[PDB]
Ligand binder design. Structure first.
Ligand code: HEC
Ligand code: HEC
Lengths: 489, 79, 337
């Protein structure tokens, strides 16, 4: 089925196509593929618009291909599309953050462009569909409707004007690619991404090579609009989703477990036959006076290695997107760079980290399972190491990152109140990889008021060697299930 | 909680977290505040609003403490 | 003789005999889901009214026979109307005042309409008047003499039902602004019948105290006396806990607030008397005619009775099938023995 077909056979039942060709509402807004998915879903849910699976997919794809955003228009807000768990969401000012980011992310707003009249219709949609909106906290404290008309609508119109849709990707992304990235909780990886065009989609296989092993996933993907790549792949009973941006023949983005989007990894991929280019090096740190194995991922790297003063070593292997080095740093801690195949490789020499932090340092986990239809939502943590830097600055905007370090993980009550409730006892547990698994959902008769296995927790990580005074904490809210969720939160 | 992406910041008493930055002021148990949130669609981005969008969401679960397992997520479970 | 009229999802109104501490009658309403919202009892305790159907309709029912006597549908094909939490029957039982939050439903867009108050003749259930009203009004309550209609919004709005106008605003948002931060008021519970006083807790803070200091936050009590027509607002304690609603006793000497704890307040000293914990979260609060029993409801499916002086639990009445009351209003009425 084609988009034009669904527009005329389903959408036209209510949406008027003006004499100029443009459609009422439809041609007065631009948004991401996820955005269009949500709008079409509402037409089906709220207005009884009957759509077969093929029609639904066709219209959403058509809208993404003709009325989407450019990749630049998504800058600073891609976290919401990637379902990135380590993120921060806010509006341009207190007024917009409180008014438009108190239910769903403000990113949902920032990833749209509309005419002034349409932004007006959108605000009317909100108070019309959610009449108690003006009675809720942050709304009943002001003349919500008056302010919406005089300040919010004009702000949206002025800040996110319609503009023009970008041209759709028009090349053939088929071929073999080399990739590199990392998965919080497991580590760094290299690999391959192979695309094979099939009609308007692509057959896709992604292979992830970690230090301890490899695994491949196969499925289907497609490029939406200017450069939004979306794909679903599987291996056995495991299914993952790829949310990448494709620009200049290079993929970048995040992939995640289809059943638990908090679990996933980030990567970049370029054509395997490309000129010398470094994607990443793992590890990116060198423990002074200790020979270590380093995997430099990239294309056409070869074995021409030029090392600086404080580092000596050699190339152990090369080819297939990875050149393995054997290096040893000597001297004072700090940034160190070398060249391989004419490309710069940045590392960091150190004897011991000045401190470690927990990423994320504030997050949630959600109870689930227990016979219910909503699965638990875990929380992944990683202990990051740092170097004070030149100005000492134990924890400021100039520190040097050392990367994730293996560590011992533990949970405990955040404060006295949580301890009285024994939250740490019923809220769940964290394993040796920093993965926190929440408890069963539903009222727990063992707790006071038969309350849920929710909890106000603290996550503590402890790393290794030299001076060994490395510990960091994170604030974790083991909270309740969410019954409403969407492509864009 | 700008860091708690996807959670609500309207604390009446809230859904993911309460006004005191904890979870003890949320309904005890959550099931006791579930319909108070659902029926007037107080947190439509987190709990199904039966006032307009999902009128039949709680059908068959009148005894929320006993039948909470019947309540479904309205998101087909995807990315 | 005291009785309680409590809504139970998805389509019921339960009459509870407080003396027998048992269910008296279960009224089932057609096309009422997901839950009745605001019930009202006419003088005599025989006829009642209740908003239902996502607050878009209202039915008249016979509390003894359980039959639906009539119905009012506020919505039309081109305009969806929500009464939300605003619906009140006049003291003489002849007029229903219904709040209306409307949205016009065009082909492919919505058009929010100005909020209104509609007056219906109770006996015939006929729409008799409609006038624009302030937005953000939760509860509507009649003056005891029936000459004024009050609407609790960003200010206490005093409307003249006969003229269909807003004649006076009693300050809420600006109350003692030189001393206190703008009052935060969350109130959707209709439960003033036993005292003639519509009351709600509100939250604020002393402006001259460090906002980072807990001592800065205070809990106040707002009381709108429907008989005298006077509204009072005053601090009653330093805020350490939150209450969803409050009810005043017939004597007008005490107020009781509840959520996760139950607390009694002395309205003569404007101070706390006692506090006790609760087995689970509750929303609604009412007081018996003799003022000796405090009734908690809402949230789940049980009405809990507490001694007004000791706050000791006296008993519990479970609704049929433990059907939840959600945030619907729970009323207490009487029948001549
Ligand atoms: C009548 C039964 C409809 C059909 C068929 C379709 N749409 Fe619709 N649409 C309808 C209404 C009443 C509204 C306004 C209220 C709302 O839910 O927003 C809309 C609105 C839209 C919009 C704008 C939404 C916004 O973000 O403000 C879009 C982009 C839209 N509709 C798209 C759309 C498409 C692609 C349809 C064919 C599958 C379609 N609509 C059909 C009513 C009806
Ligand atoms: C809670 C009461 C909300 C507030 C405050 C705002 N929004 Fe919202 N928004 C809410 C929901 C529950 C939904 C999903 C509705 C559905 O069923 O599809 C949305 C959706 C949006 C969208 C997407 C609409 C589309 O493209 O089809 C946008 C662009 C949006 N919201 C914008 C927005 C703005 C600008 C707000 C401040 C005035 C705002 N929302 C507040 C819930 C709530």
């Amino acid at each position: 089925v084609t988009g034009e077909e669904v527009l005329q056979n389903a959408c036209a039942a209510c949406h008027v196509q003006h004499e100029d060709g443009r459609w009422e509402r439809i041609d007065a807004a631009r948004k991401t593929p996820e955005g269009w998915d949500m709008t079409v879903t509402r037409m089906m849910r709220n207005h009884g618009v009957a759509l077969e699976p093929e029609e639904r997919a066709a219209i959403v794809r058509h809208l993404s291909d003709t009325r989407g955003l450019s990749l630049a228009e998504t800058e600073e807000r891609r976290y919401i599309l990637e379902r990135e768990p380590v993120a921060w969401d806010e509006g341009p000012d207190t007024s917009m953050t409180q008014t438009c980011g108190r239910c769903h992310s403000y990113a949902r707003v920032a990833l749209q462009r509309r005419t002034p009249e349409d932004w007006k219709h959108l605000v009317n949609f909100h108070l019309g569909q959610f009449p108690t909106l003006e009675y809720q906290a942050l709304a009943r404290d002001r003349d919500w409707w008056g302010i919406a008309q005089a300040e919010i609508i004009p702000f949206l119109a002025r800040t996110y004007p319609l503009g023009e849709a970008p041209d759709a990707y028009a090349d053939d992304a088929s071929g073999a690619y080399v990739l590199a990235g990392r998965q919080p909780g497991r580590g760094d990886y290299t690999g391959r991404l192979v695309l094979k065009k099939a009609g308007e989609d692509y057959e896709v296989t992604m292979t992830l090579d970690f230090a301890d092993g490899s695994r491949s996933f196969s499925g289907t993907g497609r490029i939406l609009g200017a450069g939004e790549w979306r794909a679903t792949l599987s291996d056995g009973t495991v299914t993952i989703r790829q949310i990448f941006a494709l620009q200049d023949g290079r993929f970048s983005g995040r992939w995640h477990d289809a059943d638990s989007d908090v679990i996933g990894g980030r990567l970049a991929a370029v054509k395997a036959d490309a000129a010398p280019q470094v994607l990443a090096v793992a590890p990116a740190r060198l423990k002074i006076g200790e020979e270590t194995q380093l995997r430099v991922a990239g294309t056409g790297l070869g074995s021409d290695l030029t090392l600086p003063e404080g580092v000596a070593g050699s190339v152990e292997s090369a080819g297939n997107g990875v050149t393995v080095l054997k290096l040893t740093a000597t001297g004072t801690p700090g940034p160190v760079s070398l060249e391989l195949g004419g490309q710069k490789v940045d590392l960091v020499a150190y004897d011991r980290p000045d401190r470690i932090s927990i990423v994320p340092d504030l997050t949630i986990a959600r109870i689930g399972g227990n016979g219910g239809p909503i699965p638990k939502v875990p929380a992944q943590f990683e202990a990051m190491g740092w170097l004070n830097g030149p100005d000492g600055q134990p924890g400021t905007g100039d520190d040097i990152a050392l990367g994730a370090f293996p560590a011992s993980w533990a949970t405990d009550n955040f404060d006295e109140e949580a301890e009285k409730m024994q939250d740490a006892k019923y809220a769940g547990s964290i394993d040796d990889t920093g993965l926190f698994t929440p408890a069963e959902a539903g009222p727990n008769p063992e707790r006071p008021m038969q309350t849920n296995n929710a909890g106000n927790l603290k996550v503590i990580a402890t790393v290794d060697a030299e001076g060994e005074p490395l510990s960091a904490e994170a604030h974790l809210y083991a909270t309740v299930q969410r019954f409403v969720d969407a492509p864009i939160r | 909680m700008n860091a708690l992406v996807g959670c609500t910041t309207s604390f009446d008493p809230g859904w993911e977290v309460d006004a005191f930055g904890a979870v003890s002021n949320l309904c005890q148990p959550m099931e006791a505040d579930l319909y108070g949130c659902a029926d007037p669609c107080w947190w439509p981005a987190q709990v199904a609003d039966t006032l307009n969008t999902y009128p039949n969401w709680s059908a068959g679960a009148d005894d929320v403490m006993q039948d909470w397992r019947k309540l479904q997520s309205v998101f087909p479970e995807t990315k | 003789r005291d009785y309680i009229l409590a809504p139970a999802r998805p389509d019921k109104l339960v009459v509870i005999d407080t003396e027998k501490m048992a269910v008296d009658k279960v009224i089932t309403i057609a096309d009422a889901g997901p839950t009745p919202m605001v019930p009202m009892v006419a003088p005599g305790g025989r006829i009642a009214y209740a908003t239902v159907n996502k607050s878009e309709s209202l039915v008249k029912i016979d509390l003894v026979t359980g039959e639906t006597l009539g119905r009012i549908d506020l919505s039309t094909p081109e305009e969806r109307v929500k009464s939300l939490f605003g619906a009140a029957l006049s003291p003489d039982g002849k007029t229903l005042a219904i709040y209306e939050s409307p949205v016009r439903l065009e082909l492919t867009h919505f058009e929010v309409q100005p909020t209104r108050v509609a007056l219906y003749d109770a006996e015939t259930l006929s729409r008799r008047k409609a006038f624009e009203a302030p937005r953000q009004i939760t509860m509507l309550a009649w003056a005891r003499d029936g000459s004024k209609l009050y609407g609790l919004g960003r200010d206490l709005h005093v409307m003249d039902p006969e003229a269909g106008t807003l004649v006076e605003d009693k300050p809420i948002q600006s109350w003692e602004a030189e001393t206190y931060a703008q009052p935060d008021v969350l109130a959707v519970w209709n439960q003033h019948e036993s005292s003639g006083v519509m009351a709600t807790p509100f939250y604020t803070a002393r402006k001259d105290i460090d906002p980072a200091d807990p001592t800065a936050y205070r809990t106040g009590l707002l009381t709108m006396d429907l008989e005298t027509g006077e509204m009072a607002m005053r601090e009653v304690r330093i805020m350490d806990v939150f209450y969803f609603s409050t009810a005043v006793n017939p004597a007008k000497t005490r107020a009781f607030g509840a959520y996760n704890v139950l607390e009694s307040f002395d309205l003569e000293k404007n101070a706390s008397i006692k506090r006790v914990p609760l087995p689970h979260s509750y929303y609604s609060v009412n007081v018996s005619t003799d003022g000796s029993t405090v009734w908690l409801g809402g949230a789940l499916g049980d009405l809990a009775a507490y001694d007004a002086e000791t706050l000791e639990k006296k008993g519990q009445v479970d609704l049929p099938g433990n059907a939840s009351m959600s945030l619907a209003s729970v009323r207490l009425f009487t029948r001549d023995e």
